[PDB]
Structure formats: structure tokens, C-alpha cells
Design a protein around this nucleic acid. Structure first.
Lengths: 59, 49, 136, 79, 23
RNA sequence: UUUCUUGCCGGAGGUAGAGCUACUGGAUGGCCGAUGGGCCCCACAGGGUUACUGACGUCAGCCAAACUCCGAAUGCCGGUAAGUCCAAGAGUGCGGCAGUGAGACGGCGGGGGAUAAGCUCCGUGCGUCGAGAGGGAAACAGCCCAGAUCGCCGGCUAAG
RNA sequence: UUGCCUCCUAAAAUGUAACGGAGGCGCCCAAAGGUUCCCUCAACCUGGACGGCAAUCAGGUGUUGAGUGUAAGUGCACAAGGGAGCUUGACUGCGAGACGGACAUGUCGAGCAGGGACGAAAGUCGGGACUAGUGAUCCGGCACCUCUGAGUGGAAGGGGUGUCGCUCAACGGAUAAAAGGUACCCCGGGGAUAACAGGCUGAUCUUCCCCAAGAGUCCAUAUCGACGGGAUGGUUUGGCACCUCGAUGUCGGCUCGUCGCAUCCUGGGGCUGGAGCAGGUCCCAAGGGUUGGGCUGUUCGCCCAUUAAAGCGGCACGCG
RNA sequence: GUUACGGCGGUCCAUAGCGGCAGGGAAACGCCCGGUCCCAUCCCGAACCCGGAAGCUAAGCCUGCCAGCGCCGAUGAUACUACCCAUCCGGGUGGAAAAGUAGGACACCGCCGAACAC
């Protein structure tokens, strides 16, 4: 599958792991979106930064 | 005192080879014991100085 | 009063007032009981007051159990002393009470009198406490 | 009115230094400990102060023998 | 008492989310 | 890319939680049943007699920071896949030239305090301020949103 | 109190502070070190003159208990614990490799000389069950050396090796060598740090409830109310040390106020524990008023004479 | 190839132990008799050696069966907790603890030697 992950919140006040998960996903600014594979690694990154991103399934 | 830092010297090479503690009260007499004299290259009897 | 015969360590850290009671939460001895609903360091003086209130309300008959024991020493430093210079001496004996802990139990033939005595005890106590019963 | 306490020794930085699976060299210290909380297993020696060290190169493994935790070194296949 | 109580309780606002500097 | 993030794999822990008849210090009952005091049979043999001080033991029940038969979650140490792709402005080593070594509050875990302090002392790949403007908190360093390259007679939103 | 060791705090790696909670230290052991071998009771009975909470003892199981140079983690009938022999691993002198921890500290494989045990049997076992039992450098000794030898045929006049000398205990050790007073004080700084005031807190303080036990001649609640519990206020003593130490003047009195109500008159309820009355106790509703003297530093008080009354507090303990 | 026959060795060393009931000696493992023979008692031929089969499976050994004591012990749930949401409460995602009952278990394999029939 494919996940469109959009950063909705900011890294200000976010933990180091959360910021690094965001940049590992490829998100550097609010409202930036990245299309990634719905694999275990992507799901773990999404779980770490879930409060900072909104995830959708790409049809 | 009590346990002085006695010096064990060999009988043959007569070299003060070792230093060790000994309770003078329990062992008042000079501590004669077999030790290794590097000058002699072998174990020789050493006694307290 | 209730004071331990001895304690291995007489200057202990404050009991952690967290979580609900995991043991002693049901009436195991008497017919009625007083279940705590908030955390509090219930002191030996409060225990004495509550048990005397129960005993004087039930007068002649009945049996009272005091499940909690105040074996935790809370220390107090001498009055008008600055911070530091060691820990204070043991001052109060408290039982770390958590919500759901049954503090006192009562057996008495008359239900109304038993409940009134437990109400006396609760009023003496420093926490919210309800009258629970063995019959579940 | 003062406190009789206030003394304490230096932390000795004991514990496991190479955990399970870590490749170590011969003579490498694996566990700094007081006593044998872990016992010397295979290719593992026990130091005078109870320091478990690897006797041979390999990967650190933790096993149990007669109910006693042991530190062993498993030889690593040559590449 | 009143001053500290008010300064402390004003952290219970939607904008502060239950936290303020110096409580 | 050695850094870091995520997944998985291997690993040691004794914390949170409890559990204590698993140890070291406790808790209502009766029990074969300890000194048995006490009636004594009237043995000084020997024995029931225990209204009361109640041994070990036992029965569901309870606590501990310096208790542990147990025992997480995280964290940490490694290995491995990748991800971050005009690299993080990453880690490491060697020379830069430093200042810094008075921190503050807030959230979590604690010590001292009265489990008071806008108190004090610690821990926190916790945050922010320090050194951070902007919006919200009426005003209001540390809270919340959000990190200001500069303009715009533009648009969408964050917390509110 | 200061250095070192152990534990907890310490939040399951390591590390982690406080004038946090507990203790140890800084020795001791030549047989308590090495090696080789071997073991074996914590408590009931029968008892065992004396000799019960104990003998020399004998059996069983207590299943690994039990106890065991000096506090935690370990070590057990696989014994780090308990006995025995050796004759001196008392294993010492030269020590790749690795390592754990700033210097300092700490671990050992392994190779060589010489030995000690065990030997048949193997060829195996580097001070103490382990972490404290210590003090840098300088400067000096003392033994040994294939070093130096201020022109040397040459020697005497320094170094190397191993060892010694510090409660240098303020234990990283400013000197080899050192106590105080200052209100006669001075200067450089600090609100980094105290006294006053302010601020936070509210232990203390102050003013306020109950299942009311009990007192109140009869009766919990007219008046009160123990044992316990919950708060108010910020007028005390404090705690903190946040503004101020390139200055925020203190107590008391005077003068002048202003404010709060937690009431010393004016209105009520209860008691009528006034059966009633004159009176009075208690609890609910600031406009005014709320004296003058003596003794008090007197913040406090007591006293004298009055008063309707001689209120309590805040205002930088209002106001220099 | 087989035996209630043997030793040697076997596991994140009790699911294996303790206890109770029943069974075995051709050869092994034992039991056992006297000190001429190495060796030993901090005394003792009790532990270690000599000659053994006149005699025995009582015990150890091992076999079968008992779940009584001990041991192991789920799933579920809860406690707890990382992160996240949440003004004081609390909640979501993920992970996830002993007791017990349901329960498991009176342990689990290879080398070689003896007789059996081939």
C-alpha cells in the first residue's frame, strides 16, 4: 500500500526522537506531505510522530 | 610498628630482594622464607634484615 | 495508640500516595467496613479516635478490627529551624491509605448502630470513606 | 543538631560491559561485578576482583548452568 | 493567599492548558 | 554515514507494579498444644485442672527505601535491514580560536521540607526561556500554538 | 564535615546531588597466603550422674536450609564455608594481547626463568570469597648496577634498579616553617548573601464545622465541648532568599489620616441554663463615637479615676 | 535387533524433586566376611586395599503406578507503563506482570558392554 503522511503540527516542543522520525519520513515543514510504503518501518515512524502528522491511504 | 615493613634479603646474593609486612608480635624472629633472588637466578632462602 | 514495637529504618521516605489499594479492599473480618476513597497518611491518633468512636457507639457488644496499622514514621524537624542539617526525628506514625482500602471492620447485630458507628469513625478520619459490607 | 551521615564511596561502574551478541577480543572485560553474579562460562575467565573477561575472541552469550548465570564466548566463523 | 491562589488558578484556562510558569 | 529515526533480532537488569508460608522486620481467629501461675487428685511418683500472661505452629487477610519467590514498560549495550537522498549541516579523530562552568520555570520520577514555598537538591535524545520575535493566555521570560531571509493594501490554518 | 569502602536514595545499563537515610574505615593474616586432598550439621525424640536454655556425644530428617577474619552481591553440602599435608605460588622475577575507568585506579589470557603443591592422572592452579585497609610530586635517604666520573695513568665528586621517610586526615597534598581582635576601622564588590520592609508558603499563629463522647442539678448542642477531622486570614514566630546593599531609615511617642469587620450603642433569634423581672450568656445586620493620668524603652502589660464604650487589625509592624 | 541388566555421558538443571504403593538378580551396580600384602583413621579396616563367592536384592540401583507436598503454569483481566490526547478528572495506541482455577508433569537422548533368537 501507500501512505500519504502530512505534517500538521510543529517540531517546536517535540522530542528528539519525534523530530528525527519526522525528518526520516522526509517532513521538514508543516503541511509537507510524503508518500511512503505502508511497511513496518513507515508504521513505526508514524507511531512515533502520530500526534504530529495526519496519515491517509493513497488509493 | 606492630606490622613493620620488613625487608627480605637473600642469604647467597645478599640482595634485599623483597619487602613485606610481618606482625612482630606473632613472629618476633627474623622471617626466614624461600624466595626468588633474580641475581642468583633461582629460589634461595631469604631472611629479614 | 498504635506504635510499632520497632522499625528497621526509622527515617523513611514518605509513602507514595498513588494508585488504588491492591490488598485489603474487602471486608475480611467483620460484617461492615470503612473503605477509603482518597489517599491519606492516616495517623495513629486518627486510628485511635476512630476505633474509640466505634467502640463507644456500639457500647457493649460487637467486635472491631483495625486493618491498617500506622507503622510508617513521618519525621518532623525542630520548630523554627532552617532547611538542612539532616532529617527530622520521627514525629507521626501513619498508615499509607489508598482509595479502596478497608480501614476498619465491625461486627454488630444492629445494622443501624453498626452504620452509625462507622459513620462516627469516618467523621474522625481525614478522608472520604464509605460504609461497605461483606455481602457483595 | 547535625547529621551523622554524609559519606559514600565512589561508584565502581560495575555491571555488564559487553552484552549478548557483542563480538569481543580475547582478554576483553565482559562483566565488572562483585562476586559471581555471573559465572565464567566457555572461553570466559574470572578475574581476581570477579571481573569476567573473554579468554578467546568471539561473541558474548549469556547462558544458564545449574541455575547459575554464565557468560560464554561463542567463536565467530571466519569470513 | 488570594494573590497566589488567583495567579496559580489562572493556569486552568483553555489557552494555558493547565500549565503556567511559576504554577 | 560510521551519527540519528524506525522495524526486527540477541542481551544484563530488579525500578513501576505487586508478593511474601520465598527471606529480613508485621497481623484477627481458633489449634495438637510451651512457664503454666490457679483447683488440686491430695505423691515429694504421676496426672486432668488453665477462668487468665499466652510457645512454636496454623488460617483469608495485610505493608517496606536501604525486603524480594517474582517482575514489566521505557531506557541502555550490540547486530541487522532500511529511512533520512542537490545529505542531517549528523557522528568520529586531529589541530581552530573560544565562552561556559550563577541558570529559570513547566511536565514526569524522586530526596530534604509539613510529601509548604515562585523553596532546595537530583534524574529526564523532556520542553521552553535563557539566546526567541510572531499569535493566544486581559496585562504576564519559562504555559499553549509556532521558530521571524526581505517585501505584498493575496490565500489556508495552529493555539485560541 | 572534608580522603577511601558498602548499601539505599538512584527513577531495573553506567553515572547522578543535598548539612539526605545507614554503616564502616586508616587494618589484620607467615600459616586467615598457594596448592592437593577430604568434609558435612541448623532440632525434636530416646537419652546421655553431674552435663537443663550446653559438652564428649550417638541415630533419623530438617534438603541445601544452617551457620560461615570485619556492613551489599556471592559462595554450600557442585562447598569462596570446615579440617588436613606439603614444606614455603609465602607466584616470585622478566610479562605480546586485549581491555574496564580523565590523571590516578582496576582485570586477566598468555610466553620465559625459577621454583610450590598435586602426581599415577592430567599437565593444571600469578596474595587473601571480592570491593576500603591509603598520600602525588619535590626533597632526601638505604642496598645493588655492565651507567657518569668537569684534562686524566686514574680515582674521588651524580644517575639507574628496588625500596624507605608525610593524621601532607582541609587526605590532588597553596610554606620546610603560622593564632586571634577590630564598634577606630578602611577599601573592592554583592541584593550572588543576612538584618527592615515587600513577595511566596502558612509549620506556627489567628478566626471559623461534625457520627458529638462528656460537662452543663434531669438533658450532647442555653453555654460549652474531649478524642479526631477540615479550612479561612496573612495581624506572630518562622521557612525561602524573589526586588532593593552606585542605601527601600529602625522601635516607641507626636501629627494627620484612610480602610476592613473578625460588633465595645442602634435591630433581631435562642436561652428565658433568668420559669420571671433589674440584668446576662451566646449567634446573625459600620453611621458616628470609642477619655484622662501613674508605673512602663516599653512592641506588651499592670494600676488610678472615669466612660455608652474605653474594639481588633491593614495601610513599608501607615505616617522621620 | 530386544531386557525390570549395566556403566559413561545429555537440559536456559524440580514438568526432572520429596513422599506413598507395588517388582527384580544370568552378567553388571551393590550387600558382605579376616587383616600375610599398598594405603588410611586428627581414635576407629566406618571412608581407601587384599582373597573372594558360603550367602542376600534388606538398603542403594533401576522399573511401573499414585498429583499428597513441592515444581511448572497458561488464555483472559487487572496493576504498571512508553508515547499521545486531556484546564483540575480521565482516556487512546503499543507493551504487559505472581495466585488460582483450566491445566502440565511422578522427566527428556546417544556410546559401549552382557544374555536371548537370528
Amino acid at each position: 500500500a501507500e501512505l500519504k503522511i502530512t505534517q500538521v503540527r510543529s517540531t517546536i516542543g517535540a522530542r528528539w526522537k519525534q523530530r528525527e522520525s519526522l525528518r526520516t519520513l522526509g517532513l521538514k515543514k508543516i503541511r509537507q506531505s510524503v508518500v511512503r510504503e505502508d511497511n513496518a518501518q513507515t508504521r513505526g515512524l508514524i507511531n512515533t510522530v502520530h500526534h504530529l502528522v495526519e496519515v491517509e491511504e493513497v488509493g | 610498628d606492630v606490622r613493620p615493613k620488613i625487608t627480605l634479603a637473600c642469604e647467597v646474593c645478599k640482595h634485599r630482594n623483597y619487602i613485606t609486612k610481618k606482625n612482630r608480635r606473632n613472629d618476633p624472629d627474623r622471617l626466614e622464607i624461600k624466595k626468588f633472588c633474580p641475581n642468583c637466578g633461582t629460589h634461595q632462602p631469604h631472611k629479614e634484615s | 495508640m498504635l506504635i510499632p514495637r520497632k522499625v528497621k529504618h526509622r527515617k523513611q521516605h514518605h509513602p507514595e500516595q498513588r494508585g488504588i489499594a491492591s490488598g485489603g479492599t474487602s471486608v475480611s473480618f467483620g460484617d461492615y467496613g470503612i473503605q477509603a476513597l482518597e489517599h491519606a497518611y492516616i495517623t495513629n491518633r486518627q486510628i485511635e479516635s476512630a476505633r474509640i468512636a466505634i467502640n463507644r457507639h456500639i457500647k457493649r457488644g460487637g467486635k472491631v478490627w483495625i486493618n491498617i496499622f500506622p507503622d510508617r514514621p513521618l519525621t518532623k524537624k525542630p520548630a523554627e529551624t532552617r532547611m538542612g542539617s539532616g532529617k527530622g526525628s520521627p514525629e507521626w506514625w501513619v498508615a499509607n491509605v489508598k482509595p479502596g482500602r478497608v480501614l476498619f471492620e465491625l461486627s454488630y447485630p444492629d445494622e443501624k448502630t453498626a452504620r452509625d458507628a462507622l459513620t462516627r469513625a469516618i467523621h474522625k478520619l481525614p478522608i472520604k470513606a464509605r460504609i461497605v459490607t461483606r455481602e457483595e | 543538631s547535625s547529621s551523622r551521615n554524609g559519606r559514600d564511596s565512589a561508584a565502581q561502574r560495575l555491571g555488564v560491559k559487553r552484552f549478548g551478541g557483542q563480538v569481543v577480543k580475547a582478554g576483553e572485560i565482559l562483566v565488572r561485578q562483585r562476586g559471581t553474579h555471573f559465572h565464567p562460562g566457555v572461553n570466559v575467565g574470572r578475574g581476581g576482583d570477579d571481573t569476567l573477561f573473554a579468554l578467546a575472541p568471539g561473541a558474548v552469550e549469556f547462558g544458564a548452568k545449574r541455575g547459575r548465570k554464565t557468560v560464554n564466548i561463542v567463536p565467530v566463523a571466519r569470513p | 493567599a488570594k494573590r497566589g491562589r488567583k495567579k496559580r488558578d489562572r493556569k486552568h484556562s483553555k489557552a494555558n492548558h493547565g500549565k503556567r510558569p511559576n504554577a
